[PDB]
């Protein structure tokens, strides 16, 4: 009748007592691991501890922020040559066509000289020849 410390959905959950009559006690809020956040329109992670001592599947999750990707239960900076411009479930993406190699932890790859990205387009957009 005790649920253990857990990492789940890029959130840390504390040790909790099992068999509590109060939903404030048996269900606990997880705290995001480093460089993970709850998206603007997302549910904050919460997990229920059952009477038998086993965690249920959590509701909600944290997501790795821009420039980071989930590796196991951690958020790790994108490798050079990769990028990630938003907090999302997605891995880092390889730089698109006509960009220059990015540093570690980048949110975009810079256009090759003579190429451009329109401001309306996302960072995943490949760069196009300047007319």
């Amino acid at each position: 009748k005790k649920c253990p410390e857990l990492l789940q959905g890029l959130a840390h959950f504390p040790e909790t007592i099992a068999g509590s009559d109060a939903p404030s006690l048996a269900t606990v809020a997880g705290t995001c691991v480093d460089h993970a956040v709850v998206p603007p329109g997302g549910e904050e992670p919460r997990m229920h501890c059952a009477v038998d001592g086993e965690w249920l599947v959590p509701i909600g999750q944290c997501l790795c922020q821009a420039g980071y990707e989930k590796v196991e239960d951690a958020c790790q900076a994108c490798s050079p040559g990769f990028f990630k411009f938003e907090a999302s479930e997605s891995p880092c993406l390889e730089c698109p066509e006509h960009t220059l190699p990015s540093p570690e932890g980048a949110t975009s790859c810079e256009c090759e000289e003579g190429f451009f990205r329109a401001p309306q387009d996302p960072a995943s957009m490949p760069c196009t020849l300047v007319p």
Partner: antibody, heavy 115, light 111 residues
Framework: EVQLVESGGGLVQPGGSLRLSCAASGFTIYYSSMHWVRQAPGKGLEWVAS????????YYADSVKGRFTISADTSKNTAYLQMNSLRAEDTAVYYCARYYAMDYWGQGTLVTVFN | DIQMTQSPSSLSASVGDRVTITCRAS??????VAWYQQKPGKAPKLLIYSASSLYSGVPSRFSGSRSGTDFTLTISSLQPEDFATYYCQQYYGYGGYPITFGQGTKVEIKR
């Protein structure tokens, strides 16, 4: 662990066709770029073709344009190289590999054009 | 195609030696350069990417550097497992342009 398993190589007459497969596990192929690189016996490495289903492009070495077609089925997590109008110069071990800086490689499959 | 001119085509060395392999790009390729090792009967193995980033699991005796269009792979202390062929590669533009490889450098045992 990431793994790329190739198949489909073998013996083909000139003008014939083969289809190579590159089955990926341990990652989602849609989020990667995949590449075919070939090595003729006793020679170096030569890029053949690239694909990104994420960006929606295919690119080809001049030497194979108009003859080979690179494709993928993301629902099978597999990449393909359709090789038509084969030539003696195409004989090589064909590798599939992940990303422009190719971090994982298939085990290779030998393509032998024979008369 | 941007050419990668790799030198030397071969070299003989002893275990413990410092070894340098150099590749000159025919025009600027930014830092879009990788280095690979290959042994007979095996697929190539990525050592260095983005000109100087060490790939995970590759020992720190391997390093890469860039000066303009010149790229060098240095092995600070050659190990028995390092006798192999080495290739540079450029991927400038990440698809904008043909990917090309150096012609390779065979690192052999001196005796």
């Amino acid at each position: 662990e990431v793994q790329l398993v190739e198949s489909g190589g073998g013996l083909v007459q000139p003008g014939g066709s083969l289809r190579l497969s590159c089955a990926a596990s341990g990652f989602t192929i849609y989020y990667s770029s995949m590449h075919w690189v070939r090595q003729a016996p006793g020679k170096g490495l030569e890029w053949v073709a690239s694909i990104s289903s994420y960006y929606g492009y295919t690119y080809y070495a001049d030497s194979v344009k108009g003859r080979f077609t690179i494709s993928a089925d993301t629902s099978k997590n597999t990449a393909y190289l359709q090789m038509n109008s084969l030539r003696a110069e195409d004989t090589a071990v064909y590798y599939c590999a992940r990303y422009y800086a190719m971090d994982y490689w298939g085990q290779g499959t030998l393509v032998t054009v024979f008369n | 195609d941007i050419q990668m001119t790799q030198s030397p085509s071969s070299l003989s060395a002893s275990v413990g030696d410092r070894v340098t392999i150099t590749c000159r790009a025919s025009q600027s390729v930014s830092s879009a350069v990788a280095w690979y090792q290959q042994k007979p009967g095996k697929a190539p193995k990525l050592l260095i990417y983005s000109a100087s980033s060490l790939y995970s699991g590759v020992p720190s005796r391997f390093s890469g550097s860039r000066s303009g269009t010149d790229f060098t792979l240095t092995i600070s202390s050659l190990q028995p497992e390092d006798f192999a062929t080495y290739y540079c590669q450029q991927y400038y533009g990440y698809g904008g342009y043909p990917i090309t490889f150096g012609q390779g450098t065979k690192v052999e045992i001196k005796r």
